[PDB]
Amino acid sequence: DLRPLVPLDGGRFATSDLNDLYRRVINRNNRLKRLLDLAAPDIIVRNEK
Amino acid sequence: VDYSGRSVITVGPYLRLHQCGLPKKMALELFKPFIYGKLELRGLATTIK
Amino acid sequence: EIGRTTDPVRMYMREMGTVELLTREGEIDIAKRIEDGINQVQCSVAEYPEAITYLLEQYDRVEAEEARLSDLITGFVPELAREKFAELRAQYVVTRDTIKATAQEEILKLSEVFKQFRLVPKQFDYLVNSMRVMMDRVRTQERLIMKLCVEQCKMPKKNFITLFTGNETSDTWFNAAIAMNKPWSEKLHDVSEEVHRALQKLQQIEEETGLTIEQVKDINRRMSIGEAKARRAKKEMVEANLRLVISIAKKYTNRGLQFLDLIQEGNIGLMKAVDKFEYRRGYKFSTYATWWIRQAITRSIADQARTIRIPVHMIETINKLNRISRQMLQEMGREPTPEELAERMLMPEDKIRKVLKIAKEPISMETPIGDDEDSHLGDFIEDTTLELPLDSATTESLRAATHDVLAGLTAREAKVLRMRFGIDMNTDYTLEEVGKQFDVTRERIRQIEAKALRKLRHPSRSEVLRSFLDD
Amino acid sequence: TPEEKLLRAIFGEKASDVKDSSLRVPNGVSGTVIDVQVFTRDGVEKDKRA
Amino acid sequence: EFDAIKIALASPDMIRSWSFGEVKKPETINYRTFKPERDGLFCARIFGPVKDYECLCGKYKRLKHRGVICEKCGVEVTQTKVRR
Ligand SMILES: [Zn+2]
């Protein structure tokens, strides 16, 4: 509730920007965990890091 | 800030310079906690509602 | 040329540009390398008896209503299949009964008829995992009996590795190690009782595996060689086709997912493809990898482009609506109405109303709005979970009023009513609960509560309580 | 809340099913309503005034 | 109450000290029944309940159960300003 996704009236949501930045960090994080699970080539895990 | 308002200022030269003419409507809007307490204190209104 | 740039895209483009593409015969060479690795690891698995034991146990599990056959084995290179299982049982038990000699060759023939047996990815990978874990448990006793002696006993690796390797199980390197009369001779005695039980668990592992130490080590070392070579080949080919991935990933440029997210999830799909490229069929690689790379990029964009994620099937439905609406707009002249999409699609026309109602991207709460000293939208979204202080004041006032009222009743009735309703206590008790606490049946407490309520209705009383109803 | 179940039971009232969300003239303002207009979405039954 | 503000670097162990649970997935809400979708950035399990004194699975809905983490969906029924 300091980075809210409050729905402004009209069915439209009105998110913050930190939801975007965290969502991106966590996506790239989860993807890097996968790229280390598949035992990937080096250049791909370097790109992901 | 709560308890605050603004409107256009004007002259009013009858005033002593320890007072400012302040409109009835703004004053009744700003002073509603005080009015509610006063009314239920003098008993003119049973409950706060 | 290393620095001078803070872009990650360039730092990826350069590193992928250093590597050069592949020739068709080049790709065939890499594929043959991968087959070599996989066949080497399958042979290394074949020289392991428990590699057969696990499959036998699993088939029984599928026989015993514990899995599926199709998802216990990936067919064979089901009556033919099952007679092959029984033949596996027969050759397994005969090689086990021939422990005396030719059993080298019998294990060879057993594992070679097993090589015609095709497994599930879980099956073979878990066999490899079990062999890895067994080698790890062997290396456990290894690192113990090595660290107990060269690190704790001050034994040279010259006179340790020379004899520690070669038997590893008996005492000829153990009682005769001290029988060499060395400075580490009298120093092994403190741990020789522990090293002996370390060899005890090592002997247990040898009993468990059905093979020695050195032969098992040759097997799984060849196995690890083959796997590392396969990984080397797959690294080679994927580094070849990173360019293909950038080519296919250009086109999804601005559908909400950053560019390197697209090229990275394309690469993950590409690894998926290289794990399944089949050159025997003889089609050029790019033709086959393109399906996987587009599937990966699109599954990605559907799964992680919205802030409020919507499932894959729903995004496919929305793309269908938008594409048919684009057609209807180029055709009907104007923009089609949400009932005509019902006729051009196959929708109840309320499913399309819901699908259109699925909200678009949330307006970033820092949208600039004019105006009045540069205020963003976030300044305008009030708080709704709050309760306005007049209702808080009036809750307090009603609390005080009901207290002063219930004081007017009798003490027992006031308590039965403070307990029947949740007034001034943590929970609101059942009438039977209050009865058991007061030692009376429910009907009596019901009449008591009704008596109190009826008395509270009584005008000359409850004037203020009536005043707490605003309508 | 407690004391509200008490009040409601005492005065035999059934709590409302639906919430007031009317449109009301903003505070202070007078006027004479010179025109009303109702926009009914396609597929919703037009009331009397529409 | 207090009399000075200290500022220093936050450690891994401290950062796990403030926190109530890892945020594993990026989902925010469920787009159809707008629930905090566990366990993403607005996780009812991790950051608290959405309405005061009500679990998320609806099982517990009263101040009789203040403090009880549900069994079904694990949302500590507490004031929703703990969400903050
Ligand atoms: Zn729950």
- Helix count of chain D equals 1
Distance between the termini of chain D: 42 Å
Q: Can you summarize the main beta sheet of chain C? A: none
* Overall geometry of chain D: elongated
What count of helical segments of chain C does DSSP give?
A: 20
Region (Sigma-70 factor domain-4) (chain C): 405-458
Pfam family, one (chain C): Sigma70_r2
GO molecular function (chain C): DNA binding; metal ion binding; sigma factor activity
Organism (chain C): Escherichia coli
Characterize the structure shown:
The PDB classes it as transcription. Keywords: protein-DNA complex, transcription initiation, RNA polyermase, DNA promoter melting, transcription. The entry is titled "Cryo-EM structure of Escherichia coli RNAP polymerase bound to rpsTP2 promoter DNA". Chains A, B, E are DNA-directed RNA polymerase subunit beta'. The organism of A, B, E is Escherichia coli. The EC number of A, B, E is 2.7.7.6. This is part of a larger assembly, with 3 copies of chain A, 1 copy of chain C (471 residues) and 1 copy of chain D (50 residues). With 49 residues, chain A is α+β, with helices and mostly antiparallel strands. Helices cover 55% and strands 16% of the residues of chain A. In chain A, a hairpin with a 3-residue loop joins β1 (5-8) and β2. Chain A is rod-shaped and about 50 Å long. Chain C contains 20 helices and no strands. The longest helix of chain C has 36 residues, at 214-249. In chain D, 14% of the residues lie in helices and 0% in strands. Chain D contains 1 helix and no strands. Chain D is elongated. Classes of the chains: A alpha+beta (49), C mainly alpha (471), D little secondary structure (50). Chains in contact: A-C, A-E, B-C, C-D, C-E. The A-C interface holds A 4-6, 8, 11-17, 19-20, 23-24, 27-28, 31, 34-35, 38-44, 46-48 and C 8, 12, 15-16, 231, 234-235, 238-239, 242, 258, 260-261, 263-265, 267-268, 271, 304, 307-308, 357, 359-360, 362-366, 377-378, 381, 384.
Record keyword descriptors for this entry:
part of a larger assembly, 5 chains, A: 49 residues, alpha+beta, two-stranded antiparallel sheet, 2 helices, 55% helix, C: 471 residues, mainly alpha, extended, binds zinc ion
